[PDB]
Amino acid sequence: AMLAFLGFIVQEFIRLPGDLYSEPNGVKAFFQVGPQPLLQIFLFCGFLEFNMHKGKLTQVDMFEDGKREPGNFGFDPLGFGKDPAKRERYALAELKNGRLAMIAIGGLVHHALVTGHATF
Amino acid sequence: VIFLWLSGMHFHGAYFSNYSAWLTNPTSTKPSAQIVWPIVGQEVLNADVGGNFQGIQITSGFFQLWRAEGITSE
Amino acid sequence: SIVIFHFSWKMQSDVWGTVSPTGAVSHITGGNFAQSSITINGWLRDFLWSQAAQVVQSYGSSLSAYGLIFLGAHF
Amino acid sequence: MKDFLKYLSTAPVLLTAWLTFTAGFVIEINRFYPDALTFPF
Amino acid sequence: GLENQVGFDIETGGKPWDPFGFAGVSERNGLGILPHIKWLQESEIKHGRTAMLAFLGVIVPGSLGIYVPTYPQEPDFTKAFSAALQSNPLGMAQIALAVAIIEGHYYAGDFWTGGGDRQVGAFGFDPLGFSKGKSEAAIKSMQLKEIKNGRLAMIAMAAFASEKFIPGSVPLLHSAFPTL
Amino acid sequence: DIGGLNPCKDSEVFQKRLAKTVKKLENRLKKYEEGTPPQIAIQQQITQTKQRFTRYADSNLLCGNDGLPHLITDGRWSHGSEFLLPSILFLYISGWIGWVGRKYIRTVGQTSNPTEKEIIIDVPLAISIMTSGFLWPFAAWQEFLSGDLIASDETITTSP
Amino acid sequence: VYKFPKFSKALAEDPSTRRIWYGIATAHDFESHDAMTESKLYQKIFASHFGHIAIIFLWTAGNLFHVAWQGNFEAWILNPLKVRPIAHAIWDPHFGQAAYKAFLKTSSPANLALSGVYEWWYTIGMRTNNDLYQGSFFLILLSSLLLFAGWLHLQPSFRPSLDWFKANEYRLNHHLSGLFGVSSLAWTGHLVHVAIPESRGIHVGWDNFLTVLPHPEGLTPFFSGNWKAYAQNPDTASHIFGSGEGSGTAILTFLGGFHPQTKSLWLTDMAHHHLAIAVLFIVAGHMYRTNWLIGHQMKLILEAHRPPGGRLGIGHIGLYETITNSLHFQLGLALAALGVATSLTAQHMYALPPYAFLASNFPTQAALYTHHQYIAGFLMVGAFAHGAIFFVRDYDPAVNTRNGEKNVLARMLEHKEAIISHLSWVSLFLGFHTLGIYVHNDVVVAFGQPEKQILVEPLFAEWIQAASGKTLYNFDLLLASSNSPASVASSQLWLPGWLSAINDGKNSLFLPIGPGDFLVHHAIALGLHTTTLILVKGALDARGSKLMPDKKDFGYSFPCDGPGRGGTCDISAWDAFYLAMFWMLNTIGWVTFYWHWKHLTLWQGNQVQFNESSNYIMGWLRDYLWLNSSPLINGYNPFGMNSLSVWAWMFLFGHLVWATGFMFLISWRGYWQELIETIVWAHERTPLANLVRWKDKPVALSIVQARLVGLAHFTIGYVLTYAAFVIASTIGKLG
């Protein structure tokens, strides 16, 4: 939801060169872009899902052996989180921002549906 | 259960029927008290029962019974 | 089943119908019960086959549900 | 509400709920996209 | 079983590459309905050798223009077979007979259930003493080179077929074989 | 074209069918009054009929001599949206259903009262298994490889 | 109460009427008779075979005599397309004047002949009511021969032993070569000598046959090797059958297709066919070993056929002794082959009519196809029933097993669960989806939107039609192409005749097909698979199951195993046959309904009626049954009657017998025993009737007997009502 909210705000502002990528409205951009770019995103997200969870992808398969902190993919290239004191605060901030972004992603999508122009 | 069934019959007569139109023309309007939703092409079941109404013709005689009861309004 | 068949055919053939303004009575089937309900072939043809015409020709009309239920009840 | 939820977990109630939900989303797909003889794509 | 067979190298880690576990389905349920690993390896060698020969046979005639004298000058593998089938029927008949004889002598039918006197792609056939006297590791390395080149030729021929069927499937292909 | 059929966009009998259906619907529409709900319903019927006929015309659909869309299910991808894509969709959904059913049967089969958990479903475990069926093609070709998909000789056999 | 079941003392001691009922139904089960040996079994079967062939020949002689005496064969010769053949005259005292007038044909009331014997006898060269009489005389003589042989081979010095009966190689050599090849050779001789000139106006009878050359060159080309001379100058395209106008001199040709006038196969084509078949079968009859040291020993052939890798177990090692020592295995094989053969006859005698003017005889076409398909279903069910009987009473696991490993037949009982499960899966698959598509079409058409129908073009079957030369589906495949090697190869032999016939809208050769054909073929496949499932399940489960692991100890036919273990109704293998008879009747009904409706639409010209209405069930019910039943039911009305009155009476009779079968099937015993006890008390306690008492105690029919009687009523009513419907509908619709 956070990535998708940022995607809305950037899409209506920046956009890519080309006739396909010329819709400030995210909902209408979902249709104008066509199925080919979207299906590639779907397949890439699937590849990511497979490799990040290392095969065990389902509710019964994941956490079957334990030893898996929920949400812990080990992704930390920039090194933020070495200090354990701020780690808990960062986790809480991520959770709160994620919830707020779920609410906001619903809000933006439904604004685009009831008005049709953009978010602004 | 029987009372619920009777309540359903009376509710259909009140809301999804041409009872008022049938009262003014009993001999030329066919009693109908069930309209069919327009899905999968099933709306053809809504027949020309008369009285500016579309629905399934009713053969349970509720319209005649209600008229015999003196019921003149939905 | 025999009772309701007797009722349906007898009423349609010898009670129900229309009355002309001069008083002439014309029935739904035309009085065929008296002479054709006395044989099993008569029941098969002049009642079952004859009055089943409306059920089999109901497709595309508002009575098509009756044809569908006819087939489903056979099934 | 401990045995009522167990009653709702019985085979008939669960099958009725699942079939009602299934018929519901089928009927609503056929309402919003009616007369679909072939795959939309 | 795959750990002690030629075919895996650094390109796929150090383990035998088998995402679908097709090498271990022979031991599964049924007396035999799925091929043994020996049959799969013989299919490896046969398909790879055929693919290498076919790559040479689409490159040399079609591009370089070299042709057998009394044969049609068709730089197209989708029509050359029929063109030679009509132009020189005797040559194609003899080629088919030679192929049938070679395969019948080197029959691999006991490989389906595992077993047989031969090895995977043994075939004898060492005229110019390339493996006359060599270490076992050297022979294994040469076999691995052959298998990998066969896989590469398989990929190249599949790319040829795909580009002929679906245009633009291999982007660099027409820029790497400028003539048909 | 295929099998002597012709595209429905150029089938005269198809357009005759459309015209006859529309004419019947309009004749039915004539016997009602003004913007009354019956007329609205009949107009919606006419609009839906026209939309359906137009969509069938522009759908790579082959029509016979009766002006009805015929399905080409020999396997060609040209008419792949008629059978092949719905076939894949059903195979996915039905494999999902079968996989979740089998997983639930095998999961509650190792508890103290396996038969009780079949008339009174463990809704938490049922929900856990059901949403895990999206990987049924992968789960099936990961349990067959391990030999956990097929029984061998504990299965019972009759006397002969 | 004694001496009737002479073959069974257990039945003869029954004090009830069950002894009489079971005496009839066990008379031909010779293996179960008292004081029974194998030699007596084979000898009695041999004599019964002789009596049976005598009965067949007497039946054919009766048909010939009644056509010669009361028919109009000679009149039908001069006008085969307008004169309706007469089977036999009618003398029934119950006729009124109206019935006499309606059935009156020429001089006496008579029945039209729907057996197609007129066309068959006309084709083989019969032109006189004295030719038919000669055939009847000869066939009665042959029947006398067979009866004498049957009596003779029960005499002491002429009764064959078991070794002679089980001499497989000798019987195969003789049957194949002698029976098939030599009978085909003699039939080619007759075809040429008599039939070929008779179709060209030259009469070749039992007087001028030693002096009338079948070919002008006269056996010179055959010995000289110039066999092409027999094919030169065939019948032209303007040849009038039975007349010399436009005829030829050839006797063995390839022409393909049909005669331009009779719309039937060329007589020279069929003579060549039978000559080739004769040569092939005579050659194939020398395969097996006899007293001259060369040939095959089939025991060795069967034993040596074990795949080396090993997937059929030990192969066919124990099959020779298994088949030889069992008469039910051989009977099942013969019945299966005969069922396939008569299915072939039905499927080919309508697409490739072999008899002159038979294509235009629509009622006889329908009657022949229906008759042969019903016989085919009966034969197939009998084959499977006798396979089950072999499993119950003749199968020996020790013979079919060598050192633990099982042979090809014994392994069928190891994966029996797999076979039954997959038959069940196929049946459920086909039924679910055929019914789903049919009901989808029903609902969609009923709602007034036929465009939403699911109509699958039978491309696979249309592909086959194009492969044989039909240029209707634009496939350009093998014979639809003039450049394919398949066409260039026969462009000079039989394509011009074959292509001219396959690409013709008036033929039944490769009838054009559509989505309705697809759906009905899937229905036929479902019926075949379900009947096979029932029969195979009964055969494999005959020796036992989980519910009855000792079913072999109770025999092929027993009522049940009791109400214990949850209930064991219809658990015997006989009950599987009994259940599969309904499915066979249903499948044959579907096949015959499809054939008859397709051909009624083809003959009437409204083939668009079938192509549109055959995709949904109400289409069938309204346009086949309800539509074509109108002429039949009006065979007699309160106003009069027609010659179709007998067919309406048979229609009602079939319905009545069907519902009496319903009686015997729904209501079981126990309810009929107490009622019979009440009747017994009433008879015993009434004056003026106490003077009369039964000798056999009246009891209710047994469970198995009741099932058989209900099945017999069901089947007889089914057959009678459908025969009446098809015949009367064809006659009353197509003039």
Ligand code: CLA
């Ligand atoms: C029924 C088919 C059949 C069978 C059982 C055999 C059997 C044999 N062949 Mg052989 N062969 C066949 C067809 C067959 N052939 C055909 C069509 C050709 C091409 C002309 C050859 C060419 C051939 C050569 C060149 C040689 C053999 C050899 C052999 C022998 C052992 C080596 C071997 O199998 O490798 C050869 C294996 C094959 C050629 C594979 C053939 C696969 C066939 C075509 C598949 C048919 C199966 C199919 C389901 C049948 C349908 C049945 C029905 C529906 C019609 C063995 C006796 C060798 C020999 O003589 O040893 C001394 C040998 O050198 N075969």
Ligand code: CLA
């Ligand atoms: C040449 C010598 C000869 C001949 C002519 C016969 C003839 C006959 N024997 Mg016989 N027999 C012989 C030698 C011979 N036998 C010897 C040497 C032995 C001792 C070893 C026996 C032992 C023997 C026994 C024990 C019995 C007979 C029986 C019979 C009769 C079989 C019933 C019948 O009428 O079939 C007539 C059949 C035809 C005219 C031909 C049938 C045509 C078929 C159905 C068509 C097939 C075409 C095609 C293949 C269909 C498939 C299509 C294709 C594409 C696959 C028949 C008359 C039986 C009988 O009834 O006894 C009285 C019997 O029980 N025989």
Ligand code: CLA
């Ligand atoms: C040439 C073929 C052939 C042969 C030789 C046999 C021979 C045999 N069968 Mg068999 N069978 C056959 C075909 C054959 N069958 C077919 C086609 C079927 C499937 C229908 C069967 C089904 C079958 C079963 C299920 C059983 C046998 C049994 C038997 C054995 C005892 C027969 C007996 O007791 O008769 C008894 C004869 C009768 C009871 C007479 C029945 C007459 C029927 C009801 C028709 C009469 C009505 C008639 C049409 C009236 C017309 C009505 C009018 C108003 C129009 C015997 C070895 C039995 C056995 O124990 O085998 C070991 C057994 O259980 N068979």
Ligand SMILES: CC(/C=C/C=C(C)/C=C/[C@@]12O[C@]1(C)C[C@@H](O)CC2(C)C)=C\C=C\C=C(C)\C=C\C=C(C)\C=C\[C@@]12O[C@]1(C)C[C@@H](O)CC2(C)C
């Ligand atoms: C995300 C969301 C919807 C996202 C939709 C998307 C992406 C749709 C994409 C598409 O449409 C397009 C673009 C094109 C279509 O053709 C295809 C699809 C692909 C379908 C809705 C969220 C919807 C989110 C909703 C409705 C949230 C409701 C939250 C409530 C009520 C919270 C209440 C509380 O927070 C308070 C008020 C106080 C707290 O203390 C207590 C509680 C009770 C927790």
Ligand SMILES: CC1=C(/C=C/C(C)=C/C=C/C(C)=C/C=C/C=C(C)/C=C/C=C(C)/C=C/C2=C(C)CCCC2(C)C)C(C)(C)CCC1
């Ligand atoms: C139970 C049992 C039994 C019985 C069984 C049965 C009854 C079976 C049946 C069977 C059957 C009934 C089978 C069938 C078969 C068939 C087939 C096998 C066919 C084939 C065909 C073919 C192969 C063809 C081909 C072709 C084509 C397609 C085209 C044209 C040409 C040709 C020829 C090539 C017995 C007694 C034995 C024993 C015991 C057990």
Ligand SMILES: CC1=C(C/C=C(\C)CCC[C@H](C)CCC[C@H](C)CCCC(C)C)C(=O)c2ccccc2C1=O
């Ligand atoms: C009606 C019926 C009866 C009663 C029918 C009986 C007892 C048959 C009555 C006699 C019939 C009508 C034949 C009568 C023949 C004459 C008496 C002449 C004698 C002929 C014999 C010598 C062969 C059963 O016994 C029965 C048993 C099990 C399941 C279902 C049923 C069942 O449905």
